């Protein structure tokens, strides 16, 4: 079941990223934290696709909590 | 089952074979096999490592399938069965069959194996008139000869070896005895010898052949032994036992046990002599001289074995005493000289109180250190098989309870209510004080429940008889099995593991059993209680046994002593002050006995006497009688019926189950009207069969009678029919199956009873106040198979649909809807039929593989099907018992009560989250659009 | 009661239906607001509509002006002037009902607390296949439809006004209709005896000099 | 107005009890 929950997490994260990209265009990338989140999302979708086509990249999921500090103020 | 996914999750099957009659263990022994034949006309091959079944073959259950003789040769088995009519050669390695032939007429006497020039190539068969030799490779007959003077001389033994001649021995009791020698190559009667013995009467069970074809017999009247060398002698030689100082027992038949490891060469010169019950002597014969090699007093069993050139005897006895601890020891002895082989003793014990072994078969092998290791196969008195090895703490390799192949009774008792809640009942929901107390204790209970919930989530990342508790759905019960051998089993109904066992001594093979659950587990201070009634077939003596359904120990309350034969029994719904249902027994003198006979029960019976009736059926005279109970527990004749036995004979009598509930009191056919059923609770269905067995004058009679008054509600006869008959009689209907000879097919017949359009009385149902006969509707159908069993499903409230479970001879079980067998189905469809939604009549019912409730767990030689409600409105528990035992559950109405096991939580959570997200986004978009439209 | 039910079905089949129907209704309302309409009118239409409204207001309230002005306006208007979207509203209901019937039907849901007759049984037990079961026990689809029908007042309460649920032609014709309607109206002054009504009683000078004169803001 | 009130008809009860069959 934890394998299937990752699909929901990935799809909501990628729809959020698509919204941000459409909203900002060539200004989402220059920000460091936005670039970090985009790279994390890209790695996650790449590893999910590679696994579905046929486990080292799963550790990139561990990087997800850092994104919490990307939006919370006073941090 | 269904869906191929729940396989093995709810159902289970156990296979069995009957009591062992013959066995054979000598093998390669690289292959591990044990070929056995039982008294249930079944021949099987059991694995020796574990005790499973490699292959099994089941023959006819009647006397036409009994096995008469069995032999082993290399990798093949030879069997003679069907009263000396059929001979078969089984291939042990594959389990198939080499050949099968039919012998001539006559009575089988003995089977032997012969050979020539150090090679066995023929089989010898002896019948009371003739002797035949057949080939071994193909079974083709070689020759047959007629035994001289077969009219009076009873021939009983056949002996031969690699010499090239065959002996045949016949006896006349207290008279002359004859020996005839034929030659193997052609079959001429080449020698005849006659002697006189005025002291013996048997030859098969008392005499033996030892050494170079030397006949030896015992004689207690003359107090000696008699020997005769069949080769070069024509007179008996008598030898007294005073030299060896033995003594024959009084009123006992002595026996001689020789051995012949190889059918080619001669027999061993050493042999056992069974002198007295538990008294044996291993002796050695040499030229008319007997040497006391060894003697064994107070011993249980003896057996022989041979490996290579070493012949070894095995002796089983008990240590202390009617042995003290039911503990037995097995020792190995050399046959050439009486001597123990050190480091070979095996010690075992029996759990049951009054059992003892009866058979002993031993398999030997040669160890690496040039030692002789062995294993034993022991059958006890109560049909229990044990396979013993030569270890220290693992003396018992495996065991099999083969008494469970003749189950005669069955009950299901629900487990006692869980102690953690049964005792919680006292401390929870209990009035303590005024209005300020119950809410405080309730909030404290809520606090401790919260603490328990917190404790349960903390550990997310960090079978015993006395711990049994019922499930929340009550889908697990306690099966109570009674076997014909006299053994009671208490088994878990979820995995089929024996939880307790009990034994009843001195039970005759053809007794009659009947048990009823008196007290259940719904009253904590009192124990559950069941009763069993056993009646002897010959003497007619009857006895009661009261016990606990859960633990199996006998209860302290002593049942009464039945001084007279018991004719019948009855179980009232009246409960004593101890919540035990009263049981009545009617004996041969037509006076009843009550149990328990307490003062309260006696007063209640004194008050309620004129409302209880007994009915008895005598099939020998075809006489039915009905008595009414009186105030002082006496009975008086009320009604009587007679059926002439010279025309018809009663085969069955069926009544409705006392623990069923009917939901609806009428049927709706549409157009705002109701057709009312006639639910008589005392109706009886009686089936009779004609005594004329001709294929054009045979019939089956059906009688629907009232048990109280005796009115014959219905009489019917079906012509051109023959048994056996299987009948099911339920809430409103009767369905019975039979065989039709004019068309040679199996047929179903359904009768359904209806009342008029107005209820005669909607407050009660008195059988003395029903002067109007009901309306009977009948129909018939064609069923394209035979039937071994039939039963109907049950439920708590009778809301789900009714199905018929049918046990076919192949082994499968079919579930047939009852709505298919409706007499109201019209031949010509009409608008009213459409508005009633009735299928037009069709004369054939089809069998589909998808309807089987057991996919491939076939039950062989089925005899009974049992159904239980199981505390839920959509599931019924089914147990099918024949040779095998199978247990499962069925849902006629697709289980509308429990959530499906394939529920997808993730999809529900995803769709809920998506709905919330869409709501938020749409709200934001609408608000922004309104704001932008306001400002142009 | 008669039947014994699994608590898991109560926990996992009852609430999701209510949540789904509630949020579906909310989404339907918001979507309907999002693309309600976009209408444009030319100048002549609005001018003529305002003229018609003015004529109607004259006809209705000519009794508060001097009769000469009323008839002066009535001389006018007679000679010179008068004579010279849903697919998403309904289809999602059926679609969601069918989807719920597909993915949820097959077990007893709940029971109404009042006795009913056999007429109710065919409606409330679409999914089950029993025959003699009482009509009080309901299936999943019937529960869904009942929940759908029993939320109009809740939607009207928790949400603005009423939504999230199912339920000129010719200028010359209007000109002629108003011309015909106005021709039969006559002036009836409402100030003929205002003085006598005023003189009946003293003026209501009570509760007028309370409080205090305001000094500044707040 | 029949064919209704049928579900409210609680079943009646026995007035006698009887048991037996073929001789045991
Ligand atoms: C239906 O049968 C019941 C049972 O016999 C009747 O009830 C009895 O009626 C008699 C007189 O009619 C009374 O003396 C008994 O006391 C009644 N017993 C009970 C248990 O009610 C009932 O009257 C019958 N109904 C009709 C319409 O005949
Ligand atoms: C009875 O049918 C079942 C069907 O499931 C058989 O079980 C399957 O056996 C095959 C062959 O070994 C396996 O590959 C499958 O995995 C089994 N299915 C399951 C669900 O375990 C079963 O073998 C059949 N009975 C006999 C005696 O062959
Ligand atoms: C032998 O008897 C003792 C009691 O005398 C008993 O405890 C023990 O279990 C018995 N042996 C076996 C093998 O049961």
Short mmCIF file of C-alpha atoms in Angstrom, two decimals, chain B residues 472-473 663-664 672 797-800 873 893 895-900 903 905 908 912 915-916 918-919 922-923 925-926 929 933, chain C residues 1-6 8-9 12-13 16 19-20 23-24 26-27 30-31 33-34 36 104 106-108 119 128 130 132-133:
data_model
loop_
_atom_site.label_atom_id
_atom_site.label_comp_id
_atom_site.label_asym_id
_atom_site.label_seq_id
_atom_site.Cartn_x
_atom_site.Cartn_y
_atom_site.Cartn_z
CA UNK B 472 -17.75 -12.15 17.32
CA UNK B 473 -19.61 -13.73 14.37
CA UNK B 663 -40.16 -16.33 8.29
CA UNK B 664 -43.23 -15.70 6.14
CA UNK B 672 -53.16 -7.88 -4.10
CA UNK B 797 -34.14 -16.46 10.73
CA UNK B 798 -34.81 -18.29 7.46
CA UNK B 799 -34.48 -15.10 5.42
CA UNK B 800 -31.92 -16.30 2.87
CA UNK B 873 -27.88 -14.45 8.33
CA UNK B 893 -27.40 -15.10 -1.14
CA UNK B 895 -23.11 -12.69 1.64
CA UNK B 896 -25.02 -9.41 1.90
CA UNK B 897 -24.00 -8.97 5.55
CA UNK B 898 -20.18 -8.68 5.57
CA UNK B 899 -18.07 -6.18 3.64
CA UNK B 900 -16.24 -7.63 0.65
CA UNK B 903 -12.17 -3.29 -0.64
CA UNK B 905 -9.08 1.86 0.75
CA UNK B 908 -11.48 5.90 -1.62
CA UNK B 912 -11.99 12.03 -1.30
CA UNK B 915 -12.93 16.06 -4.34
CA UNK B 916 -11.65 18.34 -1.56
CA UNK B 918 -11.34 20.41 -6.63
CA UNK B 919 -13.75 22.12 -4.23
CA UNK B 922 -13.25 25.92 -7.88
CA UNK B 923 -14.12 28.16 -4.93
CA UNK B 925 -11.62 30.51 -9.25
CA UNK B 926 -15.24 31.57 -8.74
CA UNK B 929 -13.93 35.72 -11.40
CA UNK B 933 -16.14 41.08 -13.11
CA UNK C 1 -32.54 -6.57 16.15
CA UNK C 2 -33.17 -9.14 13.42
CA UNK C 3 -29.79 -8.89 11.68
CA UNK C 4 -26.23 -8.63 12.97
CA UNK C 5 -24.06 -6.21 10.98
CA UNK C 6 -20.30 -5.71 10.75
CA UNK C 8 -16.59 -2.13 9.35
CA UNK C 9 -19.39 -1.60 6.83
CA UNK C 12 -16.42 2.46 5.52
CA UNK C 13 -19.60 2.54 3.41
CA UNK C 16 -18.10 8.12 2.22
CA UNK C 19 -18.99 13.06 1.99
CA UNK C 20 -19.03 12.38 -1.76
CA UNK C 23 -18.67 17.77 -2.00
CA UNK C 24 -20.16 16.89 -5.40
CA UNK C 26 -20.54 22.02 -3.64
CA UNK C 27 -18.40 21.48 -6.75
CA UNK C 30 -19.06 26.47 -7.82
CA UNK C 31 -18.71 25.24 -11.41
CA UNK C 33 -21.14 29.94 -10.89
CA UNK C 34 -17.86 29.78 -12.83
CA UNK C 36 -22.95 30.89 -15.65
CA UNK C 104 -20.76 0.07 -3.74
CA UNK C 106 -24.35 -5.38 -2.61
CA UNK C 107 -25.04 -5.09 1.12
CA UNK C 108 -27.54 -3.75 3.64
CA UNK C 119 -45.00 -0.61 -1.68
CA UNK C 128 -30.04 -6.95 -2.68
CA UNK C 130 -33.57 -11.32 -0.98
CA UNK C 132 -38.91 -11.88 2.29
CA UNK C 133 -36.76 -9.13 3.82
#
